[PDB]
Amino acid sequence: MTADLKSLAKRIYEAYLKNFNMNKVKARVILSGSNNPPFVIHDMETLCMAEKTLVAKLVANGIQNKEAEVRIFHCCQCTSVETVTELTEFAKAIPGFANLDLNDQVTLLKYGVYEAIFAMLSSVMNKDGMLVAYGNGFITREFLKSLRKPFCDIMEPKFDFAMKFNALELDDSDISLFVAAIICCGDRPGLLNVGHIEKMQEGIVHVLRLHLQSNHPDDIFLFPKLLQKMADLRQLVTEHAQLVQIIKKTESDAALHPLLQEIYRDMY
Numbered sequence: 210m211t212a213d214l215k216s217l218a219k220r221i222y223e224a225y226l227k228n229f230n231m232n233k234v235k236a237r238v239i240l241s242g243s244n245n246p247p248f249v250i251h252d253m254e255t256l257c258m259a260e261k262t263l264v265a266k267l268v269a270n271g272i273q274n275k276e277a278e279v280r281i282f283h284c285c286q287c288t289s290v291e292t293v294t295e296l297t298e299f300a301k302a303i304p305g306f307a308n309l310d311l312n313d314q315v316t317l318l319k320y321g322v323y324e325a326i327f328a329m330l331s332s333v334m335n336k337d338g339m340l341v342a343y344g345n346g347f348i349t350r351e352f353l354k355s356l357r358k359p360f361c362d363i364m365e366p367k368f369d370f371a372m373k374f375n376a377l378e379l380d381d382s383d384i385s386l387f388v389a390a391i392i393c394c395g396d397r398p399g400l401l402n403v404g405h406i407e408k409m410q411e412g413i414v415h416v417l418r419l420h421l422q423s424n425h426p427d428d429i430f431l432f433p434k435l436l437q438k439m440a441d442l443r444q445l446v447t448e449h450a451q452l453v454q455i456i457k458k459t460e461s462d463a464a465l466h467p468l469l470q471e472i473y474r475d476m477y
């Protein structure tokens with residue numbers, strides 16, 4: 210009569226497979242190289258071609274269309290909004306999460322979503338670029354670096370994180386538990402029921418530790434490596450939020466979707 214941690218790990222993995230449109234298996238199939246192959250965006254010509262096919266409404270305004278960098282900024286936010294919806298549904302599978310007060314659920318998701326986004330973003334990145342638009346585009350790392358400041362500073366730190374994160378060779382069963390652990394941080398600002406959240410965190414981290422022990426017997430330090438990656442993600446989000454605020458304040462055409470402005474409001 211004890212918790213079945215192996216069953217819980219499988220439940221979390223199944224909830225991740227059901228709730229996230231993108232995962233590492235799907236991304237790798239596309240990145241390896243028959244139907245709906247990804248359009249390569251490596252310069253302004255190919256960006257504009259891709260937009261006309263994949264986000265036609267955004268470029269149907271003629272001389273009124275926004276600057277390319279601002280269009281990219283908007284597209285990035287759209288993915289974040291959708292991923293927040295997926296993360297919110299995923300969180301229901303985490304033991305104890307749905308039993309928390311609604312306000313604590315909101316706070317955990319507020320601080321956790323971008324850490325989870327950047328962790329999962331790594332699955333669609335290689336050293337040369339990243340998948341976009343539900344796997345239907347591939348935008349090169351060099352093209353994103355070529356954008357005018359400060360838009361060229363958005364993605365590069367996330368590539369830097371991803372190259373090292375991907376070198377750990379996690380699979381989706383690992384990532385699902387890592388995302389659940391990200392969401393269950395008992396030290397987020399403003400939590401009410403810290404005690405219950407700490408116990409929820411302890412439980413999911415126990416599931417993660419045992420899973421990594423079983424799934425990665427070759428890497429005895431993988432668990433502390435991932436604890437450090439969680440801290441790295443918190444710093445990456447803090448810096449990202451600062452950049453988003455600079456853009457919002459100084460780029461009169463770069464707007465922030467209201468759901469994301471609420472996430473960012475009073476975060477760091």
Ligand SMILES: CC[C@@H](Oc1cccc(CN(CCCOc2ccc(OC)cc2)c2nc3ccccc3o2)c1)C(=O)O
Nearest residue numbers: 231259260281282284285286288289326329330333341342
């Ligand atoms: C800028 C403010 C914005 O920052 C960022 C910064 C980095 C990443 C994101 C979200 N993101 C990139 C989507 C790009 O989406 C397009 C689509 C079309 C296009 O042109 C045709 C160009 C880019 C993404 N997260 C994922 C999670 C898992 C799997 C894949 C994922 O991808 C937002 C924020 O803070 O929300």
